Design an enzyme around this catalytic site. Structure first.
Site, short mmCIF file in Angstrom:
data_model
loop_
_atom_site.label_atom_id
_atom_site.label_comp_id
_atom_site.label_asym_id
_atom_site.label_seq_id
_atom_site.Cartn_x
_atom_site.Cartn_y
_atom_site.Cartn_z
N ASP A 102 0.40 -1.03 0.03
CA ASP A 102 -0.04 -0.03 -0.01
C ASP A 102 0.75 0.88 0.15
OD1 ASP A 102 -2.12 2.00 0.36
OD2 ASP A 102 -2.36 1.36 2.58
N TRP A 158 5.57 -3.59 7.98
CA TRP A 158 3.82 -4.72 7.92
C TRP A 158 4.36 -5.91 6.95
CZ3 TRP A 158 3.75 0.25 6.18
CH2 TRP A 158 3.80 0.35 4.10
N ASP A 168 9.53 0.45 4.67
CA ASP A 168 9.39 1.24 4.17
C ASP A 168 10.69 2.30 3.36
OD1 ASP A 168 5.96 1.23 3.68
OD2 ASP A 168 6.23 2.31 5.44
N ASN A 213 -1.20 -2.64 6.59
CA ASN A 213 -0.62 -1.83 6.00
C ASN A 213 -1.12 -0.72 5.43
OD1 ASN A 213 -3.25 -2.23 3.67
ND2 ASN A 213 -1.49 -3.26 2.92
N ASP A 214 -2.13 -0.15 6.56
CA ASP A 214 -3.41 1.22 6.20
C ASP A 214 -2.45 2.75 7.73
OD1 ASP A 214 -4.61 0.67 4.38
OD2 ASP A 214 -5.91 -0.70 6.26
N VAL A 215 -1.23 1.43 7.73
CA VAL A 215 -0.31 2.61 8.56
C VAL A 215 0.83 3.01 7.75
CG1 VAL A 215 -1.83 2.07 10.55
CG2 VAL A 215 0.64 0.77 10.37
#
Ligand code: CU
Ligand code: CU
EC number: 1.4.9.2
Lengths: 125, 128, 359, 124, 359, 128
Positions: A28, A53, A72, A100-102
């Site tokens: 993401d 993640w 990242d 994966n929304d953080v």
């Protein structure tokens, strides 16, 4: 006997830079291989995150499942190239390290998100 | 001998996914080093020995215990042993008498710090 | 632990292949940046964040990237910090910050607003508070060492390639002001030229077609003026028309931002042009690119403009890059007629300036 | 006054178009599309004391008028109704007729939000 | 001096008409913002800049806008400043900043990450360092007064509408942790419920279908769990399926982010659904919107999803807003079957959260 | 009488686009106030009296004079009078004997500070 599929640098660019590449199943963000880096290297000037993640991806070339660590690259603004949003095996925050929304750049010296990498941990067992 | 030093980094990893204990060993000492530099409050690590399919249960119960209980339910009978929770730069050690590992059964070591057991899991075995 | 993420890497491609696209990202100007590309294969090499409306250039020695931007403790409120930052060109990492008075020019990326002296010793930048002035920064000392207030009423910096630390600027009187710095960056002497062009009746685009000892300029109506600085004083002349009667009938005129370029080895000047010109079209996308021979004052070639708005020339490799705001076109200008080699799409969101890495 | 000289009277599809007669030298975002109007800054944005000047032709009365293009500052890009018109726009050596420079430059906070089109008066 | 530019104006439309679209602008996350619209005519009313990945909410009294974001002295380098800012709702002007420990959650805009207690006395936010914890901010005192570390291993905040300062949170054991604050914002007491759902075999979406004394949740496979908190302890139950054999055949499952909603006065729950569900589609755009009667546990209606990903309900006016990332859909849900009233296009670039102004 | 106070703001404007001088007046005093708050270095203002179509020329020559010469060529014979350049909050005054304004000809007052004369221009006339 590893297997050609287990190394991105030998895979055609069109393949690893596609959101469909097998190891990007839980990405993401933006693929670092399209931002001056590679599937496992941060683009020049961006900083690798210590955390990430985790995704369990299926390698269609050898039929096996592998653990992928999505670290990242931080310290620079959004790369904006090769945006992918795949959720295979992705889970909510109560299972934090599979979520994966953080922003996984959250613990870095500088948290602004640049791009996402797809590091191969090993076989899923 | 009856020694082992296991590492833990800011990347949530153990520098060992398997530790062997010699049968000659009476009691066993397992030292843990946190090579990262993130405070324990954010990326602390610990090592917990328990039955392999009795691991999930301990981590879940340990999570509810809190950092004050090194993320291990106080007196959990399923734990063969467990170190304290350390932060970056810190180190700890746990000594347990090998006479505890049962025959035929499988034992895994792991970190019970919230969410880490998924990756920071290993297998600790005896002699051969 | 099969693989491990690593950092600290350098730009994959060799310097001789790199170009810089200043993406203003005007829709979100607070996040402008510099995209680094390989002009041979159009591959993205890296980038340098430049906050709100940043400006960029590569040190003449090609070892450092210079940026100029503005910060605020809270972006939209709080203390303002205007600065010049020095980035390493190969690692694309921040190295040094140089405080600037809170008046550095905030606007589109014309080359003339952020330049450096020929000796690469000083960074010459444009200020507007809105009173205008030109600031001097000693790169080595990492300081803002001079405020050229004599430049009030003047605009943009035009370095003199034939001198170590001298530059000119276009003034509201239609003339050129020349500034000669001393070894410490402070103004040593200055001189004004005679009126070169009529401000009200024939305004020139600020982008210069720079040569070693002279500079050419094009006007809103297709005229060409020149400022020769091979001598002690600047000798101004002009104008001569880029247009023949046929062209005048179609109403062809120059159009764009960094719209002109000069291939020194040949004397050929490149200009973005468009038909049906009239008031308000001086920044229109190029319908064609005209190639003029400054020596004989004649058009030697004309090709599609591909809607470009800005360009840049590389004397050493005889290349020309045009930019339409989001795409870069690579041209071979070794011959009179340009040759389109490749097009790099999506090089930026909103960019009006592209620059080759010096070689 | 003349009905063409006041925006509040014209349909908004009219004033929010880059083609509106008084927006002939705008390089930014129309404030009338950002919660403000042709002469009022949207809530929370700050008017700039300076501006760039344009001479626009009013096709409804055939006269030319001076337009003062003040910016609203203190907030990030509005991003709505982007216009880039250059009628009578001139380079930096004629600074106050130039629209390639942020007119929010002298404000307490210089980040550009949107552009307004203030009517000064007849051009003479 | 015919006209004069003025500022200091208030939002033109009345509060009862305003909605807030949190535009993350993920392409340039450093410039996220809040767009304020009038849901009756789709008119743009104003905005609040929120820097890098900001979160927003309107005070329960409807007089202030609360934002949470992160700053850096130089954006991509320099000291980090996590904060909560208080903005006046009518003037859309900055009023106060509240320092937060450098670990406020950075991620997509789920409602549960930035809420407030029912009494509007405290702001309850989610932290991740990555160790998770819930921080408490006393709005009046303008301070960060408590760090609920007991929430480690848990995620998101779910306020209890039947209590002045109590909230719950979903934990990795499949249960719910309830936190009751004292008048000073510090934890007074806490309690854990029994396991409500299987984390590994039937994970629920964190978005709650909140009622006055209970909350409902939907799972990746279409199951519905509930947590009743009308009593001293939370009573968990479930699951029951949203699917009939016919639905199971098409493989219908819920999908989205802020994907559920509850119309308290009717007990109707709204859910974003899509056919051909399978691993990795839990965030797919909605093919349809299913309306369930929580009382009888039956589907009373189904309509086009218009590719929505997030929604929100307004109990007082019986309205529902769906958001597909860039457009907002206004619905009338006074009757069992929703009624599409209007669509607001280009409300944002990348938004996953919309909220009505409280009335 | 023989008095006048003209203002200048940060918006580059004069609060008067015409000043009349009574014929009874021997010498004339013109006071200037800078109501803005921007430093003179950025938005300074001054007032220069000169022949109406001899204004452009003086401002251009004044620009070359520099702030040290209040943006007025030292001893420019085309200037009837000129105040100093003031900044926000500051004030200045100039006194010139009206016996200088010629018959039939038009006279305008303006600011020679780089770029301001375009808008900060006015007309100063005599008696009636
Ligand atoms: Cu751990
Ligand atoms: Cu003035």
């Amino acid at each position: 006997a590893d297997h050609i599929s287990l190394n991105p640098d030998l895979a055609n660019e069109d393949e690893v830079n596609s959101c469909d590449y097998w190891r990007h199943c839980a990405v993401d963000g933006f693929l670092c291989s399209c931002c001056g880096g590679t599937t496992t290297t941060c683009p020049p000037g961006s900083t690798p995150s210590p955390i990430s993640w985790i995704g369990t991806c299926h390698n269609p070339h050898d039929g096996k499942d592998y653990l992928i660590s999505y670290h990242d690259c931080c310290g620079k603004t959004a790369c904006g190239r090769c945006q992918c949003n795949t959720q295979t095996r992705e889970r909510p925050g109560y299972e934090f390290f599979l979520h994966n929304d953080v922003n996984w750049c959250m613990a870095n010296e500088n948290s602004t998100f640049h791009c996402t990498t797809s590091v191969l941990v090993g076989l899923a067992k | 001998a009856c020694d082992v030093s296991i590492e833990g980094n800011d990347s949530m990893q153990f520098n060992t996914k398997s530790i062997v204990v010699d049968k000659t060993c009476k009691e066993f000492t397992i030292n843990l080093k946190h090579t990262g530099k993130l405070p324990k409050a954010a990326m602390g690590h610990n090592v917990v020995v328990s039955k392999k399919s009795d691991e999930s249960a301990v981590a879940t119960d340990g999570m509810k215990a809190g950092l004050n209980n090194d993320y291990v339910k106080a007196g959990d009978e399923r734990v063969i042993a467990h170190t304290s929770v350390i932060g970056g730069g810190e180190t700890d050690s746990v000594t347990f008498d090998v006479s505890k590992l049962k025959e035929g059964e499988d034992y895994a070591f792991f970190c019970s710090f919230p969410g880490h057991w998924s990756i920071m899991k290993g297998t600790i075995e005896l002699g051969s | 632990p099969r693989e491990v993420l690593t950092g600290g890497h350098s730009v994959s491609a060799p310097q001789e292949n790199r170009i810089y696209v200043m993406d203003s990202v005007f829709m979100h100007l607070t996040e402008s940046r510099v995209h680094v590309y390989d002009y041979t294969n159009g591959k993205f090499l890296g980038m340098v964040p430049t906050a709100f409306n940043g400006h960029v250039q590569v040190s003449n020695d090609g070892k450092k990237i210079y940026t100029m931007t503005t910060y605020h403790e809270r972006i939209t409120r709080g203390k303002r910090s205007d600065v010049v930052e020095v980035w390493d060109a190969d690692k694309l990492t921040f190295e040094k910050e140089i405080s600037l008075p809170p008046k550095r020019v905030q606007g589109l990326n014309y080359d003339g607003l952020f330049r450096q002296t020929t000796d690469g010793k000083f960074i010459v930048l444009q200020n507007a508070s809105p009173a205008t002035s030109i600031g001097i920064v000693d790169v080595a000392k990492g300081d803002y060492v001079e405020d050229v207030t004599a430049a009030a009423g003047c605009w943009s910096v035009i370095p003199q390639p034939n001198r170590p630390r001298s530059f000119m600027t276009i003034c509201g009187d239609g003339g050129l002001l020349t500034i000669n710095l001393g070894e410490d960056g402070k103004v040593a002497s200055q001189s004004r030229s005679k009126q070169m062009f009529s401000v009200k009746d024939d305004p020139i685009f600020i982008a210069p077609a720079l040569d070693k000892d002279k500079a050419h300029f094009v006007s809103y109506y297709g005229n060409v003026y020149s400022a020769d600085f091979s001598g002690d004083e600047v000798k101004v002349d002009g104008p001569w028309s880029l247009l023949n009667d046929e062209d005048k009938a179609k109403n062809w005129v120059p159009g764009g931002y960094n719209l002109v370029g000069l291939h020194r080895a040949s004397g050929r000047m490149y200009v973005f042009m468009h038909p049906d010109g009239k008031e308000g079209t001086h920044k229109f996308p190029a319908a064609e690119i005209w190639v003029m021979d400054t020596k004989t004052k004649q058009r030697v070639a004309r090709i599609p403009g591909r809607d470009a708005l800005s360009m840049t020339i590389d004397q050493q490799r005889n290349l020309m890059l045009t930019l339409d705001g989001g795409n870069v076109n690579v041209y071979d200008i070794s011959q009179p007629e340009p040759k389109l080699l490749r097009t790099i799409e999506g090089a930026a969101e909103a960019s009006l300036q592209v620059q080759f890495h010096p070689v």
